[PDB]
Design a protein around this ligand. Structure first.
Ligand SMILES: c1cnn2ncc(-c3ccnc(NC4CC4)n3)c2c1
Lengths: 258, 295
C-alpha cells in the first residue's frame, strides 16, 4: 500500500538523528582505533554469511556497536564481546528464527563464556536504553527503490554493496546520516549501471539536491575505487555472488562529472 | 521493583504472566508483565519494548517503565480493566450497541494508523490483545509479535499468529507481510462485535482458508491478480460464490458493509489502509460511549 510510505520516510528521517552515534567518538576511545573496528565489522559480515542473516541485521548490529562505543570506554580485548552481543540483539530484533546464543559463543573461538555474552547483551540494552528500532542505510535504500523506473536489481545490488562497504570505515562514514549515505549509494549505483542520476522525485521526497549529496558522494566513490585494495574484503567476497548480480566486479567510473 | 504491590493476576499467556499492581509511593495503578530469565532476553520482549517506546498514542497501551534485574524482567504498563474478548463474552445476551462498536473500531483504526505510519506492524490483532476501560477507550496491546518494517518483513514458515484472524495472503503463503494483514484482523473483529460470533473460526489452515472462501467467494485472477501463482494456492480449490454481506452481517447499515467489505478486500494491495478507513462515511456520526463492564 502507498498511504504510509511518505509518513514513514519523514519518521525514519526524524529517527535517524535520534538513533545516531557521536561523530568523533573514536578519538575519545583510548584503546581502540578505526582499524580495530573495521576488522570487527568485516568479521560480522562473515558471521552474517555463515548464519544466512538479513543484511539489515548487520546494519543494525553496526549501529548498536557505534552507539555503545559512543558512551562506554571499552578495552580492545573486550571489543568482540561488544560486537557479538550487538549481533545477537540485532538478530533477535530482525531475524525470523535467530541463532542460538551457544552459537554466538561458538563463532568467537570460545574467547568468551556463554554467561559473558548474555551479561553483555543485558549491558548493551542498558546503554542503548532499549532503543533498538534504528534506521539503517538499508531501510533508506528500500524506500528509494520504490522510486525506480522500473526496478533494476543490479542497481539495487550495487547500492546495497556500496552502502555495506560504508559500515567498515568509521572514517569517513560516521560524518553522514544513513539517509545521506543511502542517497549517495543509490545515485552512484544507478550512475554505474544505467548512467542516469539522482531522480527528480527523490530530490522532492528527501529534500536532498544532488549537489547536497556531493561531499558524501565524493567519499563513497573513493571507497568504491579502492575497494579491492582495502584490508577488509568480506563484503566484496559476499557481493561477488551471482545472487547479488556480481556487482563487486563492476568497474567504478573514474570521474563522477559533478 | 520493591515499590510495587502485586494485587492480582489479570492476564495469562505464553509471553508471560500479567499482574495488576499498585505503586506504593505514587498510588498509580499499573499492569506488570513478568518474564523469567535461558537464551538471554526473549526476542518478543526486545521487540515489544523498543517498539512501544516510540509509539505514544491514546489508542496504544502506554509502556510506563521497564525494570531489569539479573534474574527477572518486568514491563510496567498503564492499567486497563479488561480485554475486548472478555467484554464480548459478557455482552453475549444483550449485544454490543452499534454506537460503541463504531467507537471501538474508530479508535482501533487510529491506533493501527499511528502504528503503520511509524513502520510498525502489529501482526497479532485479536480481541484479547485489545484493552478497554470503563470510560470508552480501547487500546492496542501485546506487541510481542509486532515488527518494524523499514525493510519489508518476511513471513515465518510456521505462522505463530492466531488462526481465526489470519489474512488470506499469509494462508496462501505470500513472502512478505504488509499493513493489509492488520486491517484484515480488525475487519474480522469488527464483524464479530456485530454478529456476536467469530467470522472465520477455522480448524486448520485449509479450514480457515475455505471458511474465508465460502463467505467472500474463492478469489480468481480477476479479483486478485497473481493469486494462482501464490505458493500455497491449489488448482483443486473449490470455487465458492461470494455471499450477500447483508446475510453475513445482518444488522449493519450500508456504510458498515461498505467498510467491512473493504477491510476484507482480497488483494492486499487494494485492501483499505487504516488511514483511509477513518475517512469512510461510516464514522460521520462517531461518538464515544461508555461500556458496561463487570469486575
Ligand atoms: C495482555 C497481554 N499482554 N499485555 N501486555 C500488557 C497488557 C496490559 C496492559 C494494561 N492492562 C492490562 N490489563 C488487561 C488484562 C486486563 N494488560 C497486556 C494484556
Amino acid at each position: 500500500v502507498p498511504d504510509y510510505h511518505e509518513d514513514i520516510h519523514t519518521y525514519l528521517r526524524e529517527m535517524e538523528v535520534k538513533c545516531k552515534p557521536k561523530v568523533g567518538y573514536m578519538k575519545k576511545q583510548p584503546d581502540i582505533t578505526n582499524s580495530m573496528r573495521a576488522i570487527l565489522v568485516d568479521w560480522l559480515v562473515e558471521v552474517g554469511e555463515e548464519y544466512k542473516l538479513q543484511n539489515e541485521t548487520l546494519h543494525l548490529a553496526v549501529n548498536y556497536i557505534d552507539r555503545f562505543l559512543s558512551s562506554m570506554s571499552v578495552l580492545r580485548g573486550k571489543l568482540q564481546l561488544v560486537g557479538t552481543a550487538a549481533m545477537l540483539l540485532a538478530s533477535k530484533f530482525e531475524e525470523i528464527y535467530p541463532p542460538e546464543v551457544a552459537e554466538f559463543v561458538y563463532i568467537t573461538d570460545d574467547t568468551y563464556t556463554k554467561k559473558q555474552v548474555l551479561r553483555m547483551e543485558h549491558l548493551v540494552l542498558k546503554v542503548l536504553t532499549f532503543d533498538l528500532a534504528a534506521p539503517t542505510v538499508n531501510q533508506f535504500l528500500t524506500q528509494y527503490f520504490l522510486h525506480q523506473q522500473p526496478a533494476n536489481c543490479k542497481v539495487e545490488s550495487l547500492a546495497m554493496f556500496l552502502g555495506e562497504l560504508s559500515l567498515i570505515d568509521a572514517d569517513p562514514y560516521l560524518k553522514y546520516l544513513p539517509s545521506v549515505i543511502a542517497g549517495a549509494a543509490f545515485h552512484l549505483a544507478l550512475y554505474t549501471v544505467t548512467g542516469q542520476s539522482w531522480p527528480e522525485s527523490l530530490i522532492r521526497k528527501t529534500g536532498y539536491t544532488l549537489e547536497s549529496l556531493k561531499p558524501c558522494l565524493m567519499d563513497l566513490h573513493q571507497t568504491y575505487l579502492k575497494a579491492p585494495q582495502h584490508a577488509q574484503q568480506s563484503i566484496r567476497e559476499k557481493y561477488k555472488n551471482s545472487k547479488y548480480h556480481g556487482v563487486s566486479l563492476l568497474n567504478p567510473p573514474e570521474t563522477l562529472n559533478l | 521493583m520493591e515499590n510495587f504491590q502485586k494485587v492480582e493476576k489479570i492476564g495469562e499467556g505464553t509471553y508471560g504472566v500479567v499482574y495488576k499492581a499498585r505503586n506504593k509511593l505514587t498510588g498509580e495503578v499499573v499492569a506488570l508483565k513478568k518474564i523469567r530469565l535461558t537464551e538471554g532476553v526473549p526476542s518478543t520482549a526486545i521487540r515489544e519494548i523498543s517498539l512501544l517506546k516510540e509509539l505514544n498514542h491514546p489508542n496504544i497501551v502506554k509502556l510506563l517503565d521497564v525494570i531489569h534485574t539479573e534474574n527477572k524482567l518486568y514491563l510496567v504498563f498503564e492499567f486497563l480493566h479488561q480485554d475486548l474478548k472478555k467484554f464480548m463474552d459478557a455482552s453475549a445476551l444483550t449485544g454490543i450497541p452499534l454506537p460503541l462498536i463504531k467507537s471501538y473500531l474508530f479508535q482501533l483504526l487510529q491506533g493501527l494508523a499511528f502504528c503503520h505510519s511509524h513502520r510498525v506492524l502489529h501482526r497479532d490483532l485479536k480481541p484479547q490483545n485489545l484493552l478497554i476501560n470503563t470510560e470508552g477507550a480501547i487500546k492496542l496491546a501485546d506487541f510481542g509479535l509486532a515488527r518494524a518494517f523499514g525493510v519489508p518483513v518476511r513471513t515465518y514458515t510456521h505462522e505463530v499468529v492466531t488462526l481465526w484472524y489470519r489474512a488470506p495472503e499469509i494462508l496462501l503463503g505470500c513472502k512478505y507481510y504488509s499493513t493489509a494483514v492488520d486491517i484484515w484482523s480488525l475487519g474480522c473483529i469488527f464483524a464479530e462485535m456485530v454478529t456476536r460470533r467469530a467470522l472465520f473460526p477455522g480448524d486448520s489452515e485449509i479450514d480457515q482458508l475455505f471458511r474465508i472462501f465460502r463467505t467472500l467467494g474463492t478469489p480468481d485472477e480477476v479479483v486478485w491478480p497473481g493469486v494462482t501463482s501464490m505458493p500455497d494456492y491449489k488448482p483443486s480449490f473449490p470455487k465458492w460464490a461470494r455471499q450477500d454481506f447483508s446475510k453475513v452481517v445482518p444488522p449493519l447499515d450500508e456504510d458498515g458493509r461498505s467498510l467491512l467489505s473493504q477491510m476484507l478486500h482480497y488483494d492486499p494491495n487494494k485492501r483499505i489502509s487504516a488511514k483511509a478507513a477513518l475517512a469512510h462515511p461510516f464514522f460521520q456520526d462517531v461518538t464515544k460511549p461508555v461500556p458496561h463492564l463487570r469486575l
